[PDB]
């Protein structure tokens, strides 16, 4: 029991580390041998005012940081955090061993701070706090819930470690310390209660970034392992002073010797990631605005995001009455994609976002249908809302500081992105119309067993779709996994049948014009994908992973989208006294004994018979439910309008028949026109993205 | 403080009442001047063993009860409880003033106990505890949460009051005491925490009824006001020794001078109640098994329900493994209807249930669409499950003790009840098929503007139905009231249009055979209703309330049923330390100072890196969700199968067309056959129920 003293009114303690670490370290200054705990009781935007600091400012010469790396955990195990930290450590070692550089050199580790923001003490895993402790950046015992009647909001552990991670097997993490290791300035933040990730970013940007004043702030998730040069290659993107943000490639981690490529769900995701990087990101980067993918690690120039972008990201549209507005109350769905928008359309500034193909990070993807569905629920809602928001507010592009040509390019890009969003909104009707027109056409033309197959597949589609709607509105994907797997299999068999029908009709026609169009259009859209993959110099996914993606595409359209739209907002709808008796059964009491007090109580109850909206949380819940259920209805109705126009469903064929009688066919020419239009749109999108990727590679190569 | 003593180990206290009551009372024995609080810490089935008692057993001559009246509250205000208590008091006064009776006489009040079981202290209203206190049956202060480390489960207040309720206006309750008043033995039970109503019945039947040993146990809800002779007329039903249960008529309370009859929702309910009593209850009572309506007050002969019926009602099918079974885990949905079944099919006993028309009780009905929907959610699920359970287990009728004729009658009745259930399961398709066939037929025949009307009403029906499904699966009726009112109005206009179409086609035909059938069948089914109402001697609802019921019938089919099926089960998915500092900012702490303990903690975290289904409530929640969502899917699919068979939807007309091509019409003869069959079923049901009501009245009159 020792005597302490609050330093400037807040608790700062310095503990020594165990001699086991010292044994490696010797093989010595102050930062290596101590670990500093601080109890942060204030808001993220008030740390300096309240007089809280970081070790970097307190040296004889204050230490200036070039690069702040933020790692966010919620409950990730020690393997994921180990992978992220090992990638970071390897990158820092690469930068420290750099020879001909003005910025990096033997003491480059002093310019990098690794800030690990974990979200809740109750929600952290103990295998992660055991890894963090083994590095030297955590000791238990001196965390406090409250200090001078002030609720402690966050615990900050600061250390500079010499030990590095050198191997991460399936079970063990290899930690070692020798002359080849590089020191890392860790900064472990542990929030007291679980607020979501935007609050973690609030702590990173409004909090420690204000004290450290980094040049670049890099965002990573736990489990995302950066490549061996990814951080350096992303940092190299910022030598253009106009770059305000940047991102790299995100790769599926295929496992040992690509063993996980046997899983159809994983190969489908591998193909999807490779094409999203090759086609979408390059095309976007040509214009100057990128919509960074959820898994990839990104970097923002700190001066770029200060001001309006962070205010919109953290608070939303501040101007708001007691009620709820659409954009202001729903922008939390598009979490990081807001920042990017506000960086590009920042007033009087000509920041651009740029995509770096030289930097990559590999992540593990869901291997089971329920967790895959739950992961994509967030992605699809975020993308849809962000695209709607960017289209509705595009005039801001013209209030920024870009020159006239870049403003025109950005306007064109936003229009194109909303065109893509609009196409993706009508996929529910597009898939059904293509399937029904194709199967019915082959049944009409050849009659053999395609009649029964057409009816059977119509009923299978209907049953699976109705069940998906009902289970996603009412139940949870964990509860019914066999059904979801069966539905995916049913849709894969459906797609196989459609491919067969297309090939059969095309061969018979070659031995009418619509199937000429289908063969030319689909061959063209496959060839453009293949050539774009070759130009990017990453073609191997075009054969190892293509058929799996083709077979699972109907499940992307029909299971992921339905669940994403049905779950937009993740809704969640006096003490008396005691008796303790003695041995004799006796005890003492306070009892109303006087007649006057009994009469008083009687009069107080005789008085009640003579004198004859809930809280904000449930009001917000009601608004969220109303807005989530109005989206589903509009989606379904606007898709069925197109279905009924093309196929003459909804009693329309009946209506035309009876109008003529006042003075039904099997199929019309609307089906032919629509079938052609859909395929031409697909081929056109492929061609546009091919031109974009070609321009990207040509410019980078020059 | 004073010195007390536990009486036999449990807390029993006797407080005097305020002299204000004594002033009326004088205008005196022990029961009037004291109120007895008991703290019940045991289970309902253990009160006697634990040595708890009631005042009735503790006189010099123990008092024998003929009739125990149970009143259950949850949070009902003082007007509803006042109405119930006033009806009870008036009935007891009628029985006490009875002259030529062996059972009732001047001291008949001694044979009646009124047991008011309120559900939770936190959930009780204070205007109800103020009314209960004003009667003399409650004083606060001496309720206890725990007694000798035993959680007190329930508080029992016992008094015999001389004051009666004489008027209940919209705002005040008139209490008065004079020579004309009759004493009432009240027994106020107040549960500590809110378990649902089955637990209240568990306390009433397994608890106080075991001590009091009543002859009859009568169940009433708070707000249900018995008629001036209803309790006596129901008690008179039990002079037949074979009667095991009985119920009376439940009436809609139309307000002052029938002012509430202006509300269409209230007149519709008035007609529905009058026909459920006139047709359904009499027909059921002829056979010998009644399915007592939710609002009506019922009575059970206590010896009838002891044993198997109460065991099934309270616990369910006791034989059960760790998993969930359908019947055993879902019988709580059909709460009281289980008892009735088990009374009739009790082994070796020939108990019957009987319906009493001489006894009635009037209740208030919901006047707003959301609360109406929420009320009927419980009714519809209970009825559907109870009917399924009774049909599946009908063989028990033959294991009972009835003679052969009554066994045959009961078997026939259960078959007929399941036929009615099966008809009610297909109303979703029946209404749509009737509407679509009728509108399309008039459009075909006369062409003028019925084409547009047919298409418009098809789209209106589709939009309203899809929206009802989506809002009942995802949202709450309180949130969207304008939409539900609008949907009811839309369906009423739809029904008006259908009535017009029927009349138009019939008049044109009179100026083909199918409309002869429609006019004859509907005229017959209206005439049978009118004649049955006249035979029952209650015809006034056949004109004051008929059109409102007709207009709201589509909303009964399409809004109440969808919401009831979509909401079957009502699913619901270390401390650290503190710092207080002195003036100097100094304080004292317990800190790991020795190097050995720091090394110990480091080794304990280095150890975690080397040694590398939830609770029952959420498992039951998952089962309930699976079973609720499997019911909706089957309901929708089995109704659409009939729709697609009759109208040739679902690609079937396409399939027949292309089969013939291998070698679509507007309407077929299946529509004619189905249209006739539906109306013949309606007329047949009306005729059967008319014969039943006629037999009931004839037998009662003889
Ligand atoms: C308009 C829809 C508005 C869009 C709103 C919303 C979009 C919903 C898309 C549904 C697609 C319907 C396609 C259609 O035309 O309906 C057809 C079937 O008639 C019906 O059965 C209508 C059922 C209503 C569906 C509402 C969805 C609710 C889900 C739960 C559903 C519960 C199940 C309800 C039934 C028990 C129309 O029949 P028909 O043309 O008159 O027959 C002529 C066929 N013939 C020419 C070969 C002879
Ligand atoms: C079979 C159903 C299995 C039953 C399972 C479940 C019962 C569901 C009842 C729906 C009634 C469908 C009636 C029907 O025949 O479908 C018709 C429309 O084709 C469709 O649009 C099918 C849409 C699937 C509805 C699944 C409900 C999901 C609710 C959300 C829905 C999301 C909206 C999905 C669309 C974007 C069939 O079209 P057709 O016959 O090929 O056209 C020929 C018309 N002609 C002859 C005049 C030229």
Extract the tokens encoding A520: 């030319």
Q: How far is CA A271 from the centre of its chain?
A: 19
Going by their DSSP bridges, the two strands A67-73 and A112-118 should be labelled as parallel
Across the interface, of B139, B607, B612, the residue whose CB is closest to A601 is: B139
Q: What angle do CA A638, A643, A649 make, to 5 degrees?
A: 120
Extract the tokens encoding B661: 């091509």
Q: What angle do CA B440, B444, B446 make, to 5 degrees?
A: 115
Q: Which among B432, B437, B466, B629 is the best mutation to test ligand 1's pocket, defined by most ligand atoms within 8 Å of the CB?
A: B466
Nearest residue (by CA) to ligand 1, atom 36, is: B429
In this structure, which ligand is nearest to the CA of A461? 2
Alpha carbon distance A474, B472 (integer Å) = 10
**Closest-CA residue to B605 (of A20, A161, A18, A131):** A131
> b/e string for B649-678 if b means 16 or more Cβ within 10 A?
ebbbbbbebbeeeeeeeeeeeebbebbeeb
Alpha carbon distance A558, A565 (integer Å) = 11
Gyration radius of chain A's alpha carbons? 31
Q: Are A217 and A70 in contact (CB under 8 A)?
A: yes
Alpha carbon distance A336, A343 (integer Å) = 11
* Interchain pair B466, A636: CB under 8 A: yes
Residue-wise DSSP of A284-300 = HHHHT-----SSS-EEE
Nearest residue (by CA) to ligand 1, atom 32, is: B636
Backbone angles phi, psi at B218, to 5 degrees: -110, 130
- With H, G, I as helix, E, B as strand and everything else as coil, classify residue A651: coil
Residues of B in contact with A157 (CB under 8 A): none
Note the CATH number of domain A12-424: 3.90.550.10
CA distances from B31 to A606, B16, B136, B176 (A): 22, 10, 11, 19
Alpha carbon distance A471, A558 (integer Å) = 13
Q: Which helix (H) or strand (E) holds B105?
A: none
DSSP assigned state of A110: G
**Closest-CA residue to B159 (of B127, B197, B187, B117):** B187
Extract the tokens encoding A9: 């009114």
Q: What angle do CA A373, A376, A381 make, to 5 degrees?
A: 125
Alpha carbon distance B207, B190 (integer Å) = 13
* Interchain pair B577, A144: CB under 8 A: yes
**Closest-CA residue to A451 (of B645, B656, B649):** B656
Q: Are B462 and B678 in contact (CB under 8 A)?
A: no
The 3-class secondary structure across A440-474, one letter per residue, is HHHHHHHCCCHHHHHHHHHHHHHHHHHHHHHHHHH
- With H, G, I as helix, E, B as strand and everything else as coil, classify residue A152: coil
Beta bridge partners of B150: B147
Backbone angles phi, psi at A487, to 5 degrees: -65, -40
Across the interface, of A5, A588, A626, the residue whose CB is closest to B3 is: A588
Nearest residue (by CA) to ligand 1, atom 31, is: B636
Substitution target in A588, A602, A633, A649 with the highest count of B β-carbons within 10 Å is A602
Q: What is the distance in A from the centroid of ligand 1 to the CA of A556?
A: 25
Q: How far is CA A101 from the centre of its chain?
A: 35
**Closest-CA residue to B293 (of B258, B340, B255):** B340
CA distances from A267 to A155, A261, A450, A660, B144 (A): 41, 5, 32, 54, 65
Judged on CB neighbours under 10 Å (0-12, 13-18, 19+), B369 is buried
Judged on CB neighbours under 10 Å (0-12, 13-18, 19+), A91 is buried
Residue-wise DSSP of A162-181 = --EEEEE-SS-EEEE-STT-
- With H, G, I as helix, E, B as strand and everything else as coil, classify residue B39: strand
Across the interface, of B9, B470, B585, the residue whose CB is closest to A6 is: B585
> b/e string for A294-309 if b means 16 or more Cβ within 10 A?
bbbbbbbbbebbeeeb
Return all residues near A591 (Cβ < 8 A) that are at least 6 apart.
Answer: B2, B141, B142
Residues of A in contact with B173 (CB under 8 A): 609
Residue of B nearest to A583 (CA): B5
Beta bridge partners of A298: A219, A247
Beta bridge partners of A252: A363
* Interchain pair A657, B666: CB under 8 A: yes
Nearest residue (by CA) to ligand 2, atom 23, is: A462
Backbone angles phi, psi at A73, to 5 degrees: -110, 155
Block residue for tokens 């109460």 = B310
Residue-wise DSSP of B402-445 = --HHHHHHHHHHHHHHHHHHHHHHTHHHHHHHHHHHHHHHHHHH
Nearest residue (by CA) to ligand 2, atom 22, is: A462
Extract the tokens encoding B384: 């559907």
Q: To 10 degrees, what angle do helices A427-446 and B652-662 make?
A: 30
- Order of strands, edge to edge, in the sheet holding A150-151? A150-151, A146-147, B578-579
Q: Are B224 and B84 in contact (CB under 8 A)?
A: yes
**Closest-CA residue to A158 (of A71, A45, A56, A11):** A56
- With H, G, I as helix, E, B as strand and everything else as coil, classify residue B506: helix
- With H, G, I as helix, E, B as strand and everything else as coil, classify residue B395: helix
Alpha carbon distance A485, A504 (integer Å) = 29
Q: Confirm or reject: Cβ of B640 under 6 Å from ligand 2.
A: yes
How many C-beta neighbours within 10 Å does residue A434 have? Answer: 18
Q: Confirm or reject: Cβ of A647 under 6 Å from ligand 2.
A: yes
DSSP assigned state of B554: H
Alpha carbon distance B501, A360 (integer Å) = 70
Backbone angles phi, psi at B184, to 5 degrees: -130, 130
For chain B, first and last CA: distance in Å?
A: 69
Extract the tokens encoding B322: 């760790």
**Closest-CA residue to B632 (of A445, A467, A238, A577):** A467
Q: Are B221 and B63 in contact (CB under 8 A)?
A: no
Alpha carbon distance B230, B95 (integer Å) = 11
Q: What is the distance in A from the centroid of ligand 2 to the CA of A270?
A: 34
How many C-beta neighbours within 10 Å does residue B643 have? Answer: 18
Going by their DSSP bridges, the two strands B173-176 and B352-363 should be labelled as unpaired
Judged on CB neighbours under 10 Å (0-12, 13-18, 19+), B592 is middle
**Closest-CA residue to B247 (of B286, B210, B204, B295):** B295
Going by their DSSP bridges, the two strands B352-363 and B225-226 should be labelled as antiparallel
Extract the tokens encoding B101: 């009776």
Residue-wise DSSP of A197-254 = HHHHHHIIIIIIHHHH--SEEEEEETT-EE-TTHHHHHHGGGGSTTEEEEEEEEEE--
Alpha carbon distance A578, A545 (integer Å) = 70
State the closest ligand 2 atom to the C-alpha of A640, by its place in the atom list counted from 1.
36
Alpha carbon distance B118, B72 (integer Å) = 6
Q: What is the dihedral of CA B119, B125, B127, B131, to 10 degrees?
A: 10
Q: Are B252 and B273 in contact (CB under 8 A)?
A: yes
**Closest-CA residue to A93 (of A73, A74, A108):** A108
Query: Long-range contacts: A101-108, Cβ < 8 Å, 24+?
Result: A103/A66, A104/A232
> Domain map of chain A by residue range?
12-424, 426-568+622-701
Q: How far is CA B92 from the centre of its chain?
A: 26
Extract the tokens encoding B272: 């529905």
State the closest ligand 2 atom to the C-alpha of A667, by its place in the atom list counted from 1.
48
Alpha carbon distance A110, A116 (integer Å) = 17
Across the interface, of A147, A626, A661, the residue whose CB is closest to B480 is: A626
Nearest residue (by CA) to ligand 1, atom 18, is: B649
Solved using: cryo-EM
Alpha carbon distance A373, A245 (integer Å) = 30
Residue of A nearest to B466 (CA): A633
Q: To 10 degrees, what angle do helices A595-608 and B19-26 make?
A: 80
For chain A, first and last CA: distance in Å?
A: 69
Q: What is the distance in A from the centroid of ligand 2 to the CA of A463?
A: 10
Q: Are B351 and B300 in contact (CB under 8 A)?
A: no
Beta bridge partners of A191: A154
Q: How far is CA B59 from the centre of its chain?
A: 38
Return all residues near A56 (Cβ < 8 A) that are at least 6 apart.
Answer: A62, A63, A65, A113, A185, A211, A212
Q: How far is CA A453 from the centre of its chain?
A: 40
């Amino acid at each position: 029991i020792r005597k302490f003293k609050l330093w400037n009114g807040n608790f700062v303690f310095d503990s020594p580390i165990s001699k086991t670490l010292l044994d490696q370290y010797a093989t010595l200054p102050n930062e290596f041998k101590f670990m500093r705990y601080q109890a942060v009781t204030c808001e993220p935007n008030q740390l300096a005012e309240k007089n809280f600091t970081v070790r970097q400012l307190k040296y004889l010469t204050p230490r200036e940081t070039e690069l702040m790396l933020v790692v966010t955990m919620y409950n990730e195990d020690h393997i994921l955090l180990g992978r992220t930290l090992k990638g970071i450590m390897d990158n820092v070692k690469y930068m420290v061993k750099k020879k001909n550089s003005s910025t990096w050199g033997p003491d480059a580790w002093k310019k990098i701070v690794v800030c690990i923001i974990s979200d809740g003490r109750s929600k952290i895993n103990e295998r992660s706090l055991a890894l963090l402790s083994s590095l030297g950046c955590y000791q238990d015992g001196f965390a406090k819930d409250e200090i001078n009647e002030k609720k402690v909001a966050m615990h900050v552990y600061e250390h500079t470690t010499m030990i590095n991670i050198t191997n991460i097997s399936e079970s063990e993490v290899s930690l070692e310390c020798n002359q080849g290791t590089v020191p890392i300035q860790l900064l472990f933040c542990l929030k007291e209660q679980n607020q979501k990730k935007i609050n973690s970013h609030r702590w990173a940007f409004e909090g420690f970034a204000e004290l450290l004043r980094p040049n670049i702030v890099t965002l990573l998730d736990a489990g995302t392992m950066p490549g061996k040069d990814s951080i350096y290659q992303l940092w190299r993107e910022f030598r253009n002073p106009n770059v305000g943000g940047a991102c790299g490639e995100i790769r599926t981690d295929l496992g040992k010797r690509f063993v996980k490529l046997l899983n159809p769900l994983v190969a489908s995701q591998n193909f999807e990631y490779k094409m999203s990087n090759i086609l979408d990101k390059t095309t976007e980067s040509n214009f100057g605005f990128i919509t960074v993918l959820p898994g990839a690690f990104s970097a923002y120039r700190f001066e770029a995001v200060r001001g309006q972008p962070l205010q919109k990201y953290f608070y939303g549209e501040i101007m708001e009455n007691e009620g709820f507005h659409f954009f202001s109350s729903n922008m939390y769905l598009a979490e990081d994609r807001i920042l990017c928008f506000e960086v590009v359309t920042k007033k009087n500034c000509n920041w651009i976002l740029k995509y770096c193909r030289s930097s990559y990070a590999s992540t593990d993807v869901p291997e089971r249908v329920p967790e895959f569905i739950l992961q994509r629920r967030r992605w699809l809602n975020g993308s849809f809302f962000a695209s709607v928001y960017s289209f509705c507010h595009f005039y801001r592009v013209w209030s920024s500081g870009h020159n006239i040509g870049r403003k025109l390019l950005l306007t064109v890009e936003f229009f194109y992105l909303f065109f893509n969003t609009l196409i993706s909104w009508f996929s529910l009707s597009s898939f059904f119309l293509v399937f029904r027109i194709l199967t019915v056409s082959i049944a009409l033309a050849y009659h053999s067993a395609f009649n029964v197959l057409s009816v059977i597949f119509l009923w299978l589609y209907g049953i699976c779709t109705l069940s998906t709607f009902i289970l996603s509105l009412g139940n949870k994907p964990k509860s019914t996994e066999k059904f979801y797997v069966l539905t995916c299999v049913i849709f894969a068999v459906m797609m196989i049948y459609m491919i067969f029908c297309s090939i059969f009709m095309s061969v018979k026609s070659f031995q009418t014009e619509a199937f000429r169009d289908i063969v030319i259009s689909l061959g063209s859209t496959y060839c453009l994908y293949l050539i774009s993959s070759i130009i990017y110099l990453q073609p191997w996914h075009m054969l190892t992973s293509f058929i799996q993606y083709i077979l699972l595409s109907p499940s992307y359209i029909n299971v992921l989208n339905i669940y994403a739209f049905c779950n937009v907002h993740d809704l969640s709808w006096n003490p008396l006294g005691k008796i303790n008796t003695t041995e004799d059964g006796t005890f003492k009491m306070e009892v109303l004994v006087s007649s006057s007090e009994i009469q008083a109580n009687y009069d107080k109850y005789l008085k009640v018979l003579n004198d004859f909206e809930p809280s904000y949380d449930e009001k917000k819940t009601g608004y969220y439910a109303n807005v989530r259920s109005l989206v589903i209805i509009f989606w379904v109705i606007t898709n069925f309008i197109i279905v009924a126009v093309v196929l003459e469903t909804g009693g329309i064929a009946d209506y035309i028949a009876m109008k003529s009688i006042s003075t039904i066919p099997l199929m019309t020419s609307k089906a032919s026109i629509y079938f052609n239009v859909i395929l031409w749109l697909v081929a056109l999108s492929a061609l546009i993205r091919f031109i974009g990727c070609s321009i990207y590679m040509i410019v980078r190569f020059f």
